[model samples]
Target chain A: AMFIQNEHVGDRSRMEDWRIRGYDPLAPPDLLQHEFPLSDKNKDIILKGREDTCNILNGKDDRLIVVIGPCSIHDPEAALDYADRLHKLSEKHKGELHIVMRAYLEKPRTTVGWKGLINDPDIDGSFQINKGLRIARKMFVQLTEKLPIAGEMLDTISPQFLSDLFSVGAIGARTTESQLHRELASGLSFPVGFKNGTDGTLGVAIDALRAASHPHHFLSVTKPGIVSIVGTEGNQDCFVILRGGKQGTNYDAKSVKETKEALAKAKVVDPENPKPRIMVDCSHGNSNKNHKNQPLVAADVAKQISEGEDQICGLMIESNINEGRQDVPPADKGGKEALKYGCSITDACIGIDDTESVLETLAQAIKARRGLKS
Target chain B: AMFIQNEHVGDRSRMEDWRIRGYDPLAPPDLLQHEFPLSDKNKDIILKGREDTCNILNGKDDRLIVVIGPCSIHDPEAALDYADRLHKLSEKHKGELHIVMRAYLEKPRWKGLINDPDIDGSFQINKGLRIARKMFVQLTEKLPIAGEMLDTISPQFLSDLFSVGAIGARTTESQLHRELASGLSFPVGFKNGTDGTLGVAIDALRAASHPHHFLSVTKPGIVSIVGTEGNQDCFVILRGGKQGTNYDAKSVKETKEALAKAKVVDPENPKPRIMVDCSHGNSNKNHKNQPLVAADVAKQISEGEDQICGLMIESNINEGRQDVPPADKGGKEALKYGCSITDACIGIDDTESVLETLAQAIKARRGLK
Candidate 1:
């Protein structure tokens, strides 16, 4: 038998494999911050907004939490424009509502679709995530100066790049039961909302809230983006969001009472109140996935609030400068320029006029509730 | 004093939101099965390959399980070209090695290609998914395939075609990934953390071995609670780390000992086995160093190290890599057709020669025993 010689051999144990052609290092979050720093004034707004929102969730504050904005942010200019308008409303209702403008940059798809702006900011399928991250952070750094921002922390690692800028974080219906999502919620700085499962089950959302409100030791990445063991003190600022589901609408009076009873039965403690706190999503399944019906859904919730349902602490409305939604152009066709300005590319949303009307209705309801308390 | 009129309203509680642009309902798994069905012969190859691989992991089978292929598949043609060659090598080493071709389509990156076959950036996921599934099914009709399941929902739509799965370093410690692994049908392999710690992967392995009930999507596209019996068929893949390559004998020994101490090794299995990935950190990020790392591993095996169950090598045709073309730049001129747009990989010639050498070494070891 011939002797077998190993032809493949090298002395160097490790060499930088920079062989891949398209590889490029992303700008670190620090560099991004330096480029678009969060001003002290903006930082105060975020910190104060978070503190006030927590007070509302804890029932220490009488103001209602209204998280409202475009369904999915495709254009930063349009989002800022909408934010400017929403900021005015937020300031106008500062006494009765702690408004956290929804600046969601991430969109979780059911099967496979555009992930979000932070994942594909160009919306051209370029997948320039690093660029997306920078753009999203830059937008938030600027937007937070005037309006407090809220976003869904979808990708597990993305938060390392942007979470510090957010006032409120959300776990989507698609990932409500995810152990990873729950663990992530426990570590986040702001109060997090758990949306009911897409099939409309509240148990998993309840389970998620319970899970997130406990100490957890798990693995996570550091600010420098290195993997490390992370331990988090339980986040008790967790609440349930009823977005309706396959089982049908769950925003009715009976469903709210059932959810509150379930929370009481489960003994989920909110340091400020023994009763469960809930937010009503006026879009998605609750509005029958119809944008036009959002006003009706909001008014119904307003009625419940006026009836002195203190546990209904917040409301989520998908609103844009313009009403309805437009189709995302195929990559080969063009870019976001091909789509309508100030409209959603994902879910249809209520127009600015309708948003103002809905805000007015809720403002009146809150005023009535305060009067009733007196 | 303005009276707020509930201006907009609609009666229909729910209508399918199929109004999305470029929206085409993906052919369900059953329909896709009807189109590019898995034949009985292919089914046996998959089922038998999985069974044999499980045996190897459990120490019932003395043969090593080599999970080898491209780091991320961007070009299906080159993948097939490589696969045809690999199929031959796998058959030649049938008795000593259980070979699963790494056919990963999804690349979990900060930003880049969706890892779908169609390279257009519009993120036409439906087209990419259908193409990927067909390509994978065709390859597996003659060869066993391994893929990384990234998007939590994308897998439920794709697991029907793949034989082996990997949860990458980025998500090795993610509770979502661990939960997903616990529910997967195929045997999963988890790469160590990017920092190269064994604790996170060990925790994931332990967590994935237990039963879990969670909300998941069904074949008919409905969300439902799925309870998995828990997957016992999982192994840690040591791909080296930021610190250095862990493919060395000392590293392997220490890792195995750690696994034993942690009691992660099942009593039912014969011995604790560790799979070394000669790429990534072990190769020092160099594709050329892969063969050298493999040689070192083969030498260890030749020395009668039975705990070394397998090795993962990222091999591609044309040897090195080419960058992904700029988004605006499209066409053949922008990219080198067969080269990777993601991680660099060792070329085909080196891959074949190394496999031959490893096979011969294992054979010689069997004779010695």
Candidate 2:
């Protein structure tokens, strides 16, 4: 059993060693943890939101939920810029929509690629996770100060560092079915959405949601040590996010109707609510792998929502300042200068202008549906 | 909408254009185009093998089938070395053991990773289709090849590529699964063994064995082509490969017995052969993850000839390899030298020695039985 831990700069080996030395990056300067005072008031709002989304999916609430943000934040400056734009938009569309920003830090690629900024900010493949953690925490705090933050928790260890800054979390298609991820979600303080498997089966995702919504004893690592079998209290705030499959787009009306019916058949939807609510991924399959089509998809989804398609409760779009993706470590002297600015290094994303247009379009659709003048 | 096609080398723009082509690079090639020359003679062997594996799980025949091989073949010398070692071993213990070498060329990762040597030789990240095709043809012609048919398009384009096919557990969890695995000439393989549970895999393998009626494009670039009913001659291959559940004697015994009982309950197994994996499961769930667990698992398996089954091994020469970044210069500088380019595979010497040991164990078991 050769544990060939590659001795690379910013790799896990050093970080693990650092942790063994009693270094907690997650702790504040005085090593005192600052806790947010959760009141009955806060709890009620969260509980109410959970019940509402659950109701919408089960045909109760009619308001659509939108989770939109940068694919990742390599730079806090860029993230804030995008955040400022989103904040104003969120306020303008307050009555008709529930908007949340997706602030994913730890990216899970199929294989070895640029593991987002939190894992490797240098993008030289040298994963400096310590620096990434600090930067990530700082950015999370900044974003949370502005609005409610949502993100995909890729690493089970990440939550210990900065999960307090987030209000919502998602288990991506890759890790949605894993027991470890489910356990992590089970312990999360906020609502979590499990995306369908990448191959596009909702069974595992549904199963994951069911699993997370219940308490279970499973193997997990804790702040103190590796607990043999950590049990969770079960979170009822769990929901489903429908990312498109590898075959084709499952975001259209037919697909949404069928998926909603499937959820109803499976009895995953709260029967009291009865009309289904699902989060539509505007990237991946919906846009045919084109980030530019994300807003277009959102606009179309808004149209569907206004047309009485109550199954859609939310939309997820991968957008940044730039319209399309730019190569990472921009190709310059070493062929890194060719990379574009404010664009995604992973999925191609829509630009800021398009994002605004789409947001406005969705708001207008909601306004029109309520019989308001356009 | 951007269908940028180019044919010039050293043209950076063209290279970028090629990278952005529609369709996932990790998906297995579709096999709708090339007609499997139905061999009445070989049908008994191939179809029977498929049925035996299926039935053994279904409580019919009780022989364990093994599919073992190198992770990915970048070097012909190393692959042939591994294959030759396996073939001679297979001959030594033919009755008690059914060994198939996994010669997978299509490596499917979540994002873009090792595009497989058959796709990118010289570690250049360049799709050397011509070279890949030639190498594939050459490798399969010599030894019985085992592989995961990951590319939905490649199989339809490339004719007569492999002898044994596996739909990886990762891809097996999908719904359009049967359409991909159905109608293959050889006995197709499925993974039970990915998510540490046998339900989805059992469902997928069983599903693959039945007739499929889905809208699929035929081979030869025809769009909106409705596929005919699928031929369900498929079996499940358990590679207790990931999320750490399948690796022990208990897991193997339980899986085999459970599958057998389930098959019997369904009465679906006609041929009755069950395949047990030695590499992914037996190796104790590591990537450079291979231990002598293969030999140990195989020996234990041979001890129970009727139940303990087929095996899978991830072997590559020079042991574990480095992950090469797409931006990094190709060849030595870009990668961790002498290691596997994709998976952390067991080296050639270890693989050869292990295979020999497995053969001996099978031989001894056969004599005893």
Candidate 3:
């Protein structure tokens, strides 16, 4: 006869205790800290954005919040180069855009494909997440030294390794509706955006935000151990991101307006901050999952912003140094060579030059809107 | 200037309308019939098993339910051979064993690989789903077909193609849990055993049995057809099918008790059901996620005439299959020839021997109990 051992692992419990004591067979990578301090300059920008994010959520600021960057930093050299360029661009558009560099480390696929940098940095099936995290954290510290960065937290425990290095975090489409993911987001320090469902339903994102807003004490491994009641203060920094859908694209003015109206009707926000902001993803459905159309869409979005599209707070552009993606090799020949510098292992992305031109165009549009010459 | 168009294309309302119209992407070729004509002999066996399942759920019967077979029927020849062996064994131990063959067609991985036989009889990636459906209908004409109902949006339209369906572990934890399984014309089986969420599996099974108003495909091509309500007859399958060596006797007994308690709380006329997957999480998690432990567990289960009334096993005549070589920038060459063409599978002789052992043990257990 088997007796029920109903033990609940809560959020506040230290992950270390759970890893050591819990019977969970699937072992995650070590998410414990390793040193990579933020430089004074980057720290200031990140601190400013962090403070600004709170203000925006609290209805103190009205600027559009833009979380932008490469899908993942496969090549450190290219990432730093991109960062150097973005630092300058951020400064120039600081007044209008709260730009956070998307320093994604994990790439989740609809099916079996290259997982991400932190799982297989060499692009080979050699899953050295431990080494990958070290490199990832070190790179994050380096970016923090230079400029504020935004990253998506794909793995549950992954945020613990490098959360301090990030200013904003995103929950991908695949895991957006998971209770575990919502619970994880509830305890996160940075403001997070929940992408619409992979099928493109806004209900999932709404459900996630609603769940995140409520304090949850579910099964979780804390740094110390698996505890039953790891309570959270609930995250209010949640926002909805429209990234097209299985049905069709939902990033146009009508769609944005419809979403805004729905949020207004639902009253998802606090009475003090009654409206929920929407982020438009220029990739995926808007571009028909193409990289080239990202800039064209961005240009149109900037124009909309200039005309005062208040609900459209920001945009997500999947851009890197290279355009398009490369497939990961099977277990036979040791995976593909470390992904082509700045190329994606998941979806096709816009190249760097086009990315820069789009940024310049958006900045110009903002300038033009303010009755200033470009 | 891409605007959303509300246009009818073929049998589809819009592009998403296509989501509900296709063939069962992963359904087995043998089960894909335009009509379901359950034969006298096999129909009786299936009905008996269903009755046993209903009875076990009601506590009127005490026996395990077993749904077992290959991951996919890559080679019909090997599949038939394994079926012959299983049929003989199933007949011999008809009293204790309730066996259903898993003729799964779709293997849902993140990145779609190996378009199932239903997609193309030849397993070619680009071939349409028509071939897949035809195969499914044809296969169902021969046997008691069981499969995972993962592609709920489209495949449910092909309900005539199967007798039993399963919802895999990956999709089991989702909120939009495919309650369509309950609405299935045939009794549906739910696999609790993925992502290691037993409670979730139970919740999903429970949810499935309840009525749901969902959007289902009406005609072959219409979009957003609303399904009136679901048929709340559903059963939970424990595939232990996961999370590091949890399929010992203790685990099975614990699961049996959990199902018993759940049934007691719910109190259905036929109660809720419990099916054990002899493969998967049981064999310490290998695609060869199978072991001889199936027979031992079956034997132990038979002795008690316990709630575990069904067993699922992954077996083929061929031992292990080869994977399509990783594609390069230029694209992949033609796939290699027939073998157990997907994951490593337990060969036929091993499956035959295991079934034989299960049959003898069942006979003896029935005598003793």
Q: Model 2, which residues run further than 4 Å from truth?
A: A1-61, A224-229, A330-340, A372-374, B1-369
Model 3 regions lying over 4 Å from their true place:
A1-31, A34-43, A57-59, A225-228, A270-276, A328-339, A368-374, B1-369
In angstroms, what RMSD does candidate 1 have relative to the true structure?
21.1
Question: Per-residue alpha-carbon lDDT of model 1 for A1-374, expressed as tens digits?
Answer: 11122233342453533332333345444445544666798889899979988888877887789999999887899988888899899888888888889988756777877778877887776677767877888888878888788888676887877887888889988889899999999999999999999898889999999999999999887654347899999899989999999999988899888888878777885434564379999998999889999999889988988988888878999999999988888657876678888988888899999988999899888898888966
TM-score on B-chain, cand. 2: 0.70
Candidate 3 lDDT by residue in tens digits, B42-95:
556555545655565555754445566767655454556566666766676566
Give the per-residue lDDT of model 1 (tens digit) for B1-369: 111222233424436433322222343444344445567867887787788777887778778778888888777777788889899988988877788998887556512223334565445554566677777777887788887867677785568666777888999988778888998877888888898888888888889999988887665444688888888888888987887889888998888888888897643444645888988889877899999999999988888877777888888877787765666686535778667777888887898888876887688778778
TM-score-based ranking: 1, 3, 2
Query: TM-scores of the first chain across all predictions?
Result: 0.90, 0.82, 0.83
lDDT tens digits, residue span A233-260, model 2: 9987677777888757777788788778
State the lDDT at B266 in candidate 3.
Answer: 43
Worst window of 10 by summed lDDT in candidate 3 chain B: B23-32
Interface RMSD of each: 20.9, 22.4, 18.9
Q: Give the true-structure RMSD of model 2.
A: 25.5
Calculate model 3's interface RMSD in Å.
18.9
Which sections of candidate 1 miss by over 4 Å?
A: A1-24, A270-276, A330-334, B1-369
Model 1: pairs clashing at backbone N, Cα or C within 3 Å: A17-B285, A21-B323, A22-B323, A125-B121, A129-B111, A288-B13, B319-B347
Per-model tally of clashing residue pairs: 7, 58, 52
